[PDB]
Structures are given as C-alpha cells and as structure tokens.
Amino acid sequence: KVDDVTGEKVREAFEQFLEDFSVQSTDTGEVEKVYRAQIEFMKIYDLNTIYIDYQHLSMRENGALAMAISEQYYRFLPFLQKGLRRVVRKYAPELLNTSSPEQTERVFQISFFNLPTVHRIRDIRSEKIGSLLSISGTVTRTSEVRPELYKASFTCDMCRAIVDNVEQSFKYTEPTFCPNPSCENRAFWTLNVTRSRFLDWQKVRIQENANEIPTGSMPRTLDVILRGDSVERAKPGDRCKFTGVEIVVPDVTQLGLNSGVTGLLGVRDLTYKISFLACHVISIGDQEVFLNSLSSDEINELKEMVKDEHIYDKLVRSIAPAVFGHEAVKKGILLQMLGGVHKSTVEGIKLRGDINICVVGDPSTSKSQFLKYVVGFAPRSVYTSGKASSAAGLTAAVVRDEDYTIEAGALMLADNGICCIDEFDKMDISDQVAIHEAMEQQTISIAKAGIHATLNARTSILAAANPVGGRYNRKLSLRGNLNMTAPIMSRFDLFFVILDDCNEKIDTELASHIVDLHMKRDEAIEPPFSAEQLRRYIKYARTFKPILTKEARSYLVEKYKELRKDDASYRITVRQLESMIRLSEAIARANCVDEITPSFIAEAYDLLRQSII
Amino acid sequence: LRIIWGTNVSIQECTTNFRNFLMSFKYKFRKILDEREEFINNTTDEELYYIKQLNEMRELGTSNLNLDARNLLAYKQTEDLYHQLLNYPQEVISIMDQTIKDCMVSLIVDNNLDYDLDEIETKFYKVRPYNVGSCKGMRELNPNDIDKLINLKGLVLRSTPVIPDMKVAFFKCNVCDHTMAVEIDRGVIQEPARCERIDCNEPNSMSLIHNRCSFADKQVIKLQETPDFVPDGQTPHSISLCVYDELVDSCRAGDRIEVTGTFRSIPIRANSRQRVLKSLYKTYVDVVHVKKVQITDQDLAKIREVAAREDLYSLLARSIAPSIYELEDVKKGILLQLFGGTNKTFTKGGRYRGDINILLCGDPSTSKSQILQYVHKITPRGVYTSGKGSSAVGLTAYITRLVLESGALVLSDGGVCCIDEFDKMSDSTRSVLHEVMEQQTISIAKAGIITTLNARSSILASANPIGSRYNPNLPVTENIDLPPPLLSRFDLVYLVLDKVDEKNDRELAKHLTNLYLEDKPDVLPVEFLTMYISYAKEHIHPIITEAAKTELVRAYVGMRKMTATTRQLESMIRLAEAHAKMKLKNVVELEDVQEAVRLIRSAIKDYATDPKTGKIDMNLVQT
DNA sequence: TTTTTTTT
Ligand SMILES: Nc1ncnc2c1ncn2[C@@H]1O[C@H](COP(=O)(O)OP(=O)(O)OP(O)(O)=S)[C@@H](O)[C@H]1O
Ligand SMILES: [Mg+2]
Ligand SMILES: [Zn+2]
Ligand SMILES: [Zn+2]
C-alpha cells in the first residue's frame, strides 16, 4: 500500500511520546513517563480513550510532531491509533484486547486536550479543515447519544462470506466486492450487527459568546459532534471548550446513500457543510465533600471568613458593589441566593424553600444594573425583559425535529437557580399566569401539542418591575400601584419598593460615587470579598441545613401574630409566615448555623416589616 | 504564442504591456490622465506608483493589489488592456496576477534583497481592480453584460456564513490505497477511471475522500440596489453576490459599499434528480474588489488646525446642516451625539457606553424631519425610518430561517439611528426601544430563540407635542406626553417652537428665497468634517477631570435639589466627554461640563421654562 | 406550536 513514510514516522514518534515521554512533576522533575503511567491507569480501569496534553507533545520532539499532527490530524489519525495499539501491546497487551467468549479488538480514542489556543466560531476557516483545534462557546442544543457504526460487518447473502472491520463514511457504506474471490456478490450485504462495532455519538450545537464578535452581528453557531466517552460529557447551555478537528460534512442525499462538484456522485453534484468533531471536552463556563473539592488555602480562607462575625454585614456590603445604597435590597439578594430549606411534609405536600423576590422601583433606580450583577454573579441564572419575551421561551417550548419535541424555556434554562425577570411590569398577563402556575407548582407541564411532559421547574425568581406610571404613588397601595395579578403577589416572597428622595446629602454622596465610578472605573469599587470567595462561602452555606429552635418557634409565633395585627390582611397571610420561616432559614445559612435563632427571626421580621412599608 | 480565445488579446503582449505598466508607470501618468496639472506633486507623480506599492507590499507581505481603472487608462501600453479587462475580465485578471507575482520575484531578485523567493512564489498574488466602469443601475443589467466587470453600488442586506468552496479533489485507490488529487476544473471533477498506478489501474477503485480533499472559503451577500439607481416604478432589487477568499466576511449588514466584480450567470437544475437545466440562468457576481462607502499627516494637520480655530464648536454645528437656517443649539447637540462620549468598558459593573440620545419634540414644519435626513446622511452607519412604517419586530429583531433578522437598531449598532415621527410610533414598540437603548443591547427571549445582541447606537427621535402645536398652557411634560421612563432615557430634548418673530421670520424667508434663486445652490468640507469626527472618536479619548467631577457633583446636586435622575448625571458626564472629544481633548475640563449644563437647559428651554406649573412662557422662549 | 403582518 501507500508507504506514507511520514505517517509511519509519526506513528513511531507518537508511540515514543506515549511510552518514553519521561516527564513528571510529581517528585519534582523525576520522570515517570506520565503517558506510560496513564497506560497503567488504563489497565487499572480498562477504558478506551487516552487523554493527551497538546503541550506535552509540543515539548516532545520540539513540537514538530505537534505541528504535523495539528495540521494533518485526519491523515495521521490511523497511524496514531496503530502506534497506540503497538504501545499497548508493548506494555498493556491485556488492554490490546477488549478483555467468557473471545474478546474483540479494543478501540482507543486519542482525545488530545490542553491545546495552545482556542479559535472562535467565526475564526473557523476552510484552511483549518482536518486540523486539530479547540473551540469555545455555550451548548445551545444537544442530541441523544446514538450508536454510530464505527466498524461494519456484513454476511454475503449469496455465499455467506462474512465481512468485518469495514469503516463507514458519512453515508452508510457497504462492501462492494465479495472478499471470497470465488463469489461475485456486489450487493445483498446483510449487515452483521453482532460482528460490527458501533461507537456512541451525539450531535451538539453551540453559539457565539457575547464578548466574541458582538459588533453588529448575530451570534454564529456551530454543530460540534461528541464521540466516545465525550458523548454526554458536557451539560447543555454551558460555555465549554471543545478540542477536535474541523470536519466537512457532505450532503448524504447527494452522495446517494450554488452547485456542487460532479463528474465523479457521477453525474450528481455534491454540496458540503463544515462541522467539528470533538475529541475532548472541557467546561470553561456534601458540606465535607464540598470542602474536599476546595483547596487547602481555599479551606483556610473559608474558615477565615467563617470566624469573622461581621461576615454577614460585609457580605451584604459585597453584594452589588457597583450599586450604591439600597442595603436592605442587597440583603434580599444575599438571602435569596442562599435560599431556604425546601421540604416535603409527611403528608407529601412539597414546601418550597426558595425565595422569589420582587422589586418595584422608579426608572433610573439601577434595578437594571441590579439584575445584571445578580445574573452575572449567579450560577443557573437567567435574565430576561418582561416587555419582550415569550411564555414558551421563558418556561418551555414545543418544536418538531426528526418530529415533535421540546425546548427548554428560561425557567428550565435556570431551574434550581436564579431567575431574573426584568421589565416584569411590561410582562404579558397571560404569560404572568403561566409563570404563576409554574412557579407556584415549582413545576412546568407541557400539556399542549399532544405531549403531556413535565419538568422540575424549581427555582428562585428575582422579579423586577416599575410602578404604574413610572412612579410609585405612596398614597396608593402596592396592590394597585403596579399592574400584576394579586395571587402572584401572594407568592412573591419580598417586595423591595424603591422611591426617590431629595436628601441633598444623599444626592451629593451618590453623585460623587457615580462620578468616581466613571473617573477611577474599576478602582472605585472595593467589596469586602472577591466574587469567587463570595460564591465559595455561599455554596458552603448552601451546604448548611438550618433547624428551627424552641425559642425560635415561639419568637416566630408571636411575630406572626404581631404582623397579622399590624395589617389589621391584604398583604399578611399564611404565605407570609411561610416566607418568614424561609427567611429565617436563609439568615441561619448566612450565619452558617444548622439551627435557627430568635435573632435571625427578628432580622427576618424587620425585613418583612420594611417590605410592608 | 499565448492569446485569449475569442478575443484576439495576446497574452504575451498583454503581459508585456501590463509589466511596463507595473514598473515604469509613474503616477504622473495617472494625474496627467486626470489633468489636475495644478495639483501635480513631483514626488508622488514622478514616483513609479506601482513600483512603490510593490515595495511596500513586499514589506507588508500581502498578496492583494488594489487597482484603479484610471491607472490602466493612463499607460498607453495598458490602455488597451483596460478595455480587454472590461470585455474579458477573468483571463485578464489571471494573467495580471501572474504578472504581478513575476514582477515581485524580479524585484526581490533584481534588488538582491534578503527575501524568501519561495514565499513570493508561494504568495498567490492577486489584483483587486476597482473603478472599472461607471456605476450602472443593477436593474439596468442585461444578459450580454455577462462576462464583464460591472462597477456597482448598494447596501448589504445580509450575508451568509462562509461555505466550504471545494478547491481540489483528493482521491484514493480502494485496492492498493494509491491516492491522487484532482483539481476542481470549472467547478467539476473528472475522476480517474482507473488507478493512476498502472500497476494497479483498478477501475472505479479511486474514491474521493472528502476530508482529505481541499476546500476553499466562499460567502454570499445580498446587496440592495441604491434608491438613486432605481426608478419610482418598483421596489429596489438585490443581488446575492458571491464573495471569496479574504473578501469573505469583509463586511457586516447595512454596509453602503461600492464593489467591482465580474457578471456571472449559471444554469440551474430543473430537476435535481436529472441533469435537465432550466432554460433561464441564475445570475450572480464575483466581486474582485470592494469599496467601503488612513488619516494622512496633511489630514491630521488640517484637523488640528481646525481644532485650533475657536469657532470649531459653532463652525462644526453650522457645517453639519449648512442649509438649515438657525437652530445652532440643536445643531450643536446633534454634533455632540455624532461625536459621542467615551465607552469606558469597565471589567466589572458592565460596560458604560458614552452614547448620546436626542429627541426632537416640537411644533411641526420646523425642519426636524429634514434635520433627521441630514443626520442619517452624515453618519456612515445610518438608519432612517418612521414609527408608522416601523415595527418593533423589524426595529430590533425578526424571527426567520430557525434564524433571526437584524432590526433597524441592529443595523445602527455602532452608528446613529433615526426614528421619524417617533411620537406616532406605537407605545408597545416604545417599550421595546426602552430597554434596548438603556442597555445598548437587544435581549431576545423566544421559544427556541433566547439570547442577547449588541445594540450600541445613538437614536435621534423626532416627535410632536400631543397638541399639534406645543401648548404653553399645557406643561412641557404634558405637551410632550411621553413615558417618564422613556423621557429619562433620552439625553437631550429640544423643544423647538415656531415663535412668531417678525425679524427671525424675515431672516428665514430671506434664506429660503435665496436658496430658491440659485437653481442648484462658512462650513467644513463634509468629507473633511467626517474625517475630523472619525479621527476624534478613534484617537481622542476624553477622561474626567478633577474640576470637571467636582462641578458635575455640584451641578447634579443642584438639579436634584430643584426631576434629576441619575441618568441626568450620566448624560451631562457623557456630554462633557463628547465636548472634550469635539475639542480633541483626551481629558475632560470644567468648561465641557459648563457647556453640557448650558445646552441641557437650552434644549428644554429652561431659561424660559416656568419655575413652577411645568409650563414655558412663549414670550420668554427666544425672548 | 410559534411568530407574524395584516385584515376582519
Ligand atoms: N430653521 C429652519 N431652517 C430651515 N428650514 C426650516 C426651518 N424651520 C423649518 N424649516 C422648513 O420647514 C419645513 C418643515 O419640514 P419638517 O422637517 O417636516 O419640519 P418638522 O420640524 O420635522 O416638523 P414636522 O416633521 O412636520 S412634525 C421644511 O421645508 C424645512 O426646510
Ligand atoms: Mg419634518
Ligand atoms: Zn459472497
Ligand atoms: Zn490502485
């Protein structure tokens, strides 16, 4: 056959890079041949794929091998796999076989990782076709894993000659001429499913990131393909980097299974479609188990702010560092992010522990910046404007793809996390009702379109509206000062109503603060804690499970009685007591106390009292 | 010899003439062809323009050579080659590219410069001819024009994502594995019937390996025919020009660009299954060169000289709308918006765009619409529309195929936008506009379509008071009757009124009548004005100043003390920034803040605005 | 179903 002496040279260099790499940071520069050690671990677990750092092979042999493979990855891949099999035979001959009946050949997936750079979706070019690259972006769509037919096998339906180890092209391929020279069967190739080996496969769609080419352009999208262990390796709707080769997808319909090339196809033309074949995938976007996940210094820092007793106030201060004032509102953020203990009673009734906050401020109150910080600083956080939004896009949508199927809405896109709702006032009343039922149920059911599916839809909602007429009439009542269905009002945990004040001192302070925010830009802000530090502490608190206390039971019952008397009930109901308990849970989580404290209930009582105004 | 089939255009003589046109072509040839003997500069003119370009091109190492028609029409040897190209472009351009490559090779070897001749040999040198012919209406095109360069002007409606453009076919034997590469000739493949190795010569064993094959990059762009070219009879047409190579992805949507390219037509399969082709032919164009709609040291000198002039502020204000009579304050405000503020993209807290937003609410007949037309003409990225003819969906984003269509705002992102009859524009679409201008970004939330888009663009709204004529009896806010939030969103609001001032009426009538006198009737050169504004935006970057910040604090405290939303503070901040930019200042100054406040009061007519009742005394207005 | 001008 074709010598491809360069190919076999690359094979040899690749096996020598896999076995004689002789590099290891463990025990300082002491060489372990980390690829030989990875082969040893491979024997321990008997996987298929081999993780290969691009930088390792780059330092290997001056990176000439890295360059060659990175360009002609497609051409070199069979040689690389053959060399990997040779290495396995050398050191892990057991793994050389799949490893009872006969064990077939084991396929090894060379999933290179840690590439030098990531090229953006628009950076993609035909020049890179077949070259190993890495692409970043969020996963807009995915596919159910399905068994691509890697190696095919067919029984000759005229002589029974069985074929095997037939690689398939994009279109389902079949043997052309019977291997049995005596036989002359050119069709009738009953696929031997048992003999043939199928690899797992999954289509995945991604879109351009916001700060990628935002300049006057719609975010470009790419169809990457997951194979082998990579399948399902990443969750949907998350920014991740995919390393692999650029694959050109010919139209199978043209293959037969502007114009296109022809005269091969034969008379038929052929139109292509570029795509990407991911080899390795990396995402970039218990209390004791969480601590284990943390680094030693990270655990120390955790303990450090745990020891701090002002920690509560400093955290509240850290919230929305750019935003000035409205400290109670920042406290509301913190508490909602912490959430509350969700529980289902013995009777089974589910009791939500989440907190759905609502904000009613005049324009320019920076509520927009408020939500921007919230979502940006919040995982599982979705931001949307009520004025421009569709119910299905917000909760869930039904689409037909070969065939009726479903598409997650904002609630799904952020279920079990923050749900920012900007311009809520402008939001459609019917859509508001859809959310109402969905959030109250903590569940979304797609009854329509024939299908009757249902999804968890559990999450927290940060409603953001403006008072009717762009201004809150203090003479009027919250219910009436803003257009919104009262029952949904009942299930909004909080209502931060933002008013204007002519306090000259406050005006001067805020003006100076803004002007500094522009002068010194980032230098102006200085929260007590870093956002990553804040998130680590927050998750640690999430790990906590507050427990109610006898004194707390009492304090709660008297405080609820006092609230009922205060309204004496347009805004005071059993829902208010439920929110009181949830706020107590959130405060304890901020206090990182497994038990509730009447002080915590006092804080929550003051919070709700202020919300009442 | 080497001749072009069907043309009697000798490739050898063509090559010799174009070579002599490459070296020994003084720019003097061009300028003399353009006459302008009063403007001839020896250095430039005596310079072998194309030789200097080739030297600078080797220094840059690019393989593309922009080329005007006039240079060819100036060199007697290549004057004929000009018409040859006009008639039979493809072959002429191929020969010309080969000649440029050979000339670069000669230059490096002749100049014995230390350069990789292989690189130049590897460099696929191309020529990007432009100005080939007078811009002709695209609708005017007819079949015989095919196979010729057609200079064209239009607006980019939309562009396709780059497509793999099959370049060279790669085959492989299925019995001995021997491989061969078939170059795509005429967009088709002539597969080898048997193996290239006569040793094997297996029939049909040669199979095309798609991945191993070579592909190029192609893109297609819909280009609207400009309203100037089209007649009143029918709507403008558009052509999906096919772009290739670097030219691919070389323009966004809404790009007023002039392009030269060969006129191309092709058959279309009547039945995809069969080879039967419809008698009529699909037609496209391959752009050899694209023209979009460097500040020379002389240009910078002129810019800085004008900046030296004290009248700079008022001079630009009048220059932007020379024909308009009076309205200097409105002109100045829109001039500032054209300049725009500073986009301090904070790493935290989000980005803070220095955008300026001006609405024009006032009694009609005031030329507000004419002013909008001017603004749209001036801004390189302009978006003119009227509320009645506008839809919120079409304004920002329209679902399509699942795919999204850029809205008017999207077409303005990074430019100025014009919304005529803004008051008439629906309140719902108003709400749509609110957040997008506030965040300078479009947020999308729909079934299967949920994302956000950049919308950093200025909007110039034209409204009319609820009372057709502004009623001073009604408070200014009532006269405008616009959402208080929306009202705040806008940065400036000029309350133009048609005060009956016999003197001003006389003067305006004189202006209009004088205009009438001349059948076809100081101020900066609009081109030089645009260059000034650009250079200011790109190079100048105003930064707040200590005195400026103190004055801003005190001023906004007074405002709120007398309502003064925080957006008012940001507005005066960005306005002082744009003022400093107008003054070519990278640092803000107290005087910029003073001017910002002065113009803020002017547009609202605060001088004549009643301290109470929210009304304005018409007598005080313009005194 | 979802989005969508347009008329009814
Ligand atoms: N100061 C002015 N200088 C020059 N022309 C003016 C002036 N004021 C009004 N005009 C003319 O008056 C006419 C009014 O045109 P428009 O642009 O429609 O006025 P307008 O201010 O936009 O008010 P509308 O559009 O009716 S709400 C035009 O012919 C203008 O040229
Ligand atoms: Mg007008
Ligand atoms: Zn057989
Ligand atoms: Zn062969």
Q: In chain A, positions 88-147, which contact chain B (CB-CB < 8 Å)?
A: 122, 124-127, 129-130
- Cβ B406 under 6 angstroms from ligand 1: no
The two three-digit tokens of residue B371, written as one number:
């002013």
User: Residue A73, Cα to own-chain centre: how many angstroms?
Assistant: 29
Domains and CATH numbers, chain A: 2-93+105-117 (3.30.1640.10), 118-146+200-251+271-285 (2.40.50.140), 147-199 (no CATH), 296-613 (3.40.50.300)
Q: Which residue matches tokens 């810019």?
A: B303
* CA A586 from centre of chain: 25
* Whether the Cβ atoms of residue B406 and residue A218 lie closer than 8 Å to each other: yes
Which residue, by CA, sits nearest to atom 6 of ligand 1? Answer: B367
Token pair of B447 as six digits: 């079934």
CA to C1' distance (Å), from B447 to C2? 7
Contacts of residue A88, Cβ cutoff 8 Å, sequence gap at least 6: A39, A95, A96, A106, A108
Q: Which residue has the tokens 């950076």?
A: A123
Contact B439/B405 with Cβ under 8 angstroms? no
Query: Distance between CA A457 and CA A413 in Å, rounded?
Result: 9
Phi, psi of B482 (to 5 degrees): -125, 155
Does the CB of A407 fall within 7 Å of any strand C atom? Answer: no
> Which one-letter amino acid corresponds to residue A48?
N
Contact A140, A237 (CB under 8 A): yes
Phi first, then psi, for residue B197 (nearest 5°) are -70, 110
Resolution (A): 4.1
Identify the H or E element spanning A199: strand A197-207
CA distance B477 to chain A (A): 13
Round to whole Å and give the CA distance between A177 and B567.
77
Q: What is the dihedral of CA B130, B135, B141, B143, to 10 degrees?
A: -30
Contact (Cβ atoms closer than 8 angstroms) between residue A116 and residue A45: no
- Distance (Å, whole) CA A256 – CA B203: 20
The two tokens of residue B525 are: 């050169």
Helix axes B76-87, B11-22, angle to 10 degrees: 120
Residues of A annotated in the binding site for ATP, as ranges? 361-368
Nearest to B606 by CA among B587, B592, B620, B619: B620
- Counting other chains too, the contacts that A601-605 makes at CB distance below 8 Å and 24 or more residues apart are A601/A552, A601/A555, A601/A556, A601/A559, A602/A555, A602/A559, A604/A580, A605/A559, A605/A562, A605/A563, A605/A580
Q: Count the Cβ atoms, other than its own, within 10 Å of residue B17.
A: 21
Candidates B268, B446, B477: best to mutate against A (most CBs of A within 10 A) is B446
Q: Write the DSSP symbol of residue B214.
A: E
Tell me which protein residue sits closest to nucleotide C2, measuring alpha carbon to C1'. B447
> Which residue of B176, B207, B210, B240 to mutate against A (max A Cβ within 10 Å)?
B210
Nearest CA in chain A to B248: A125
Contact across the interface for A426 and B431, Cβ inside 8 Å: yes
CB A581 within 8 Å of CB A548: yes
A508 at the B interface (CB within 8 A)? yes
How many other CB atoms are there within 10 angstroms of residue B82's CB atom?
Answer: 20
Name the token pair of A205.
């769609």
DSSP count for chain A of H helices, then E strands: 22, 21
Question: For residue A98, what is the DSSP state?
Answer: -
Do A10 and A80 contact (CB within 8 A), yes or no? Answer: yes
Q: Which atom of ligand 1 is nearest to the CA of B371?
A: 17
Is B366 touching ligand 1 by the criterion CB < 6 Å? yes
Ion ligand 4: residues, Cβ under 5 Å? B 173, 176, 178, 195, 200, 202
DSSP B435: H
d(CA B547, CA B515): 46
Contact flag, residue A393 CB and nucleic strand C, below 7 A: yes
Q: Verify if strand C has an atom below 7 Å from the CB of B392.
A: yes
- The structure tokens listed for B378 are 């001036």
**What is the amino acid identity at position A444?**
I
CB distance B514 to ligand 1 below 6 Å: no
Amino acid at B537: K
* Unique residue bearing structure tokens 């010194």: A520
Span CA (B427) to C1' (C6), Å: 19
CB distance B215 to ligand 1 below 6 Å? no
Q: Taking a contact as any Cβ pair under 8 Å apart, which residues of chain A between 448 and 507 contact chain B?
A: 466, 469-471, 500, 502, 504, 507
Q: Do A2 and B549 touch (CB under 8 A)?
A: no
Residue with tokens 């306005």: B575
* Nearest partner of B336 among B576, B573, B593, judged by Cα: B576
Q: Are strands A197-207 and A146-156 parallel, antiparallel or unpaired?
A: antiparallel
CB pairs under 8 A between A and B: 228
Residue A232 region by backbone torsions, left for phi larger than 0, else alpha for psi between -120 and 50, else beta: left
The rounded distance, in Å, linking the Cα atoms of A501 and B564 is 11
Start-to-end C-alpha separation, chain A: 86
Q: Is the dihedral of CA B597, B602, B605, B609 positive or negative?
A: positive
Q: Between the CA of A250 and the C1' of C1, what is the distance in angstroms?
A: 31
Whether B295 lines ligand 1, by a CB cut-off of 6 Å, is no
CB contact under 8 A, A385 and B565: no
Residue whose Cα is closest to the C1' of C5: B391
Residues B152, B135: Cα–Cα separation, whole Å: 5
Residue of A439, A415, A417 lying closest to A427 (CA atoms): A439
| Alpha helices (H) in B23-61, listed in sequence order | 27-33, 42-46, 49-60
Q: Which residues of B554-589 are buried (b: 16+ CB within 10 A; e: fewer)?
A: ebbbebbeeebbbbbbbbbbbbbbbbbbbbbbeebb
> Which residues sit opposite B445 in a β-bridge?
B450
Judged by its nearest atom, the ligand closest to the C-alpha of residue B192 is 4
Q: Does ligand 1 lie within 6 Å of residue B318's CB atom?
A: no
In chain C, which nucleotides are within 7 Å of a protein Cβ? 1-6
Q: How was this structure determined?
A: cryo-EM
| Radius of gyration of the CA atoms of chain A, in A | 31
Distance CA A258, CA B216 (A): 14
Nucleotide C2 C1' to residue A459 CA (A): 25
Residue bearing the CA closest to ligand 1, atom 1: B325
Cβ B177–A214 below 8 Å, yes or no?
A: no
Beta bridge partners of A224: A204, A276
Cβ of B328 below 6 Å from ligand 1: no
Residue type at A128 in one-letter notation: K
Q: Is A70 left (phi over 0), alpha (psi -120 to 50) or beta?
A: alpha
Radius of gyration of the CA atoms of chain B, in A: 30
By CA distance, what is B486's nearest residue in A?
A363
Amino acid at B111: N
Integer CA distances (angstroms), B91 to A461, B244, B262, in order = 66, 17, 11
Gap between the Cα atoms of A459 and A381, Å rounded: 9
Beta-carbon-side half-sphere exposure of residue A171 (alpha carbons within 13 Å): 15
Neighbouring C-alpha atoms within 13 Å toward the C-beta of A108? 28
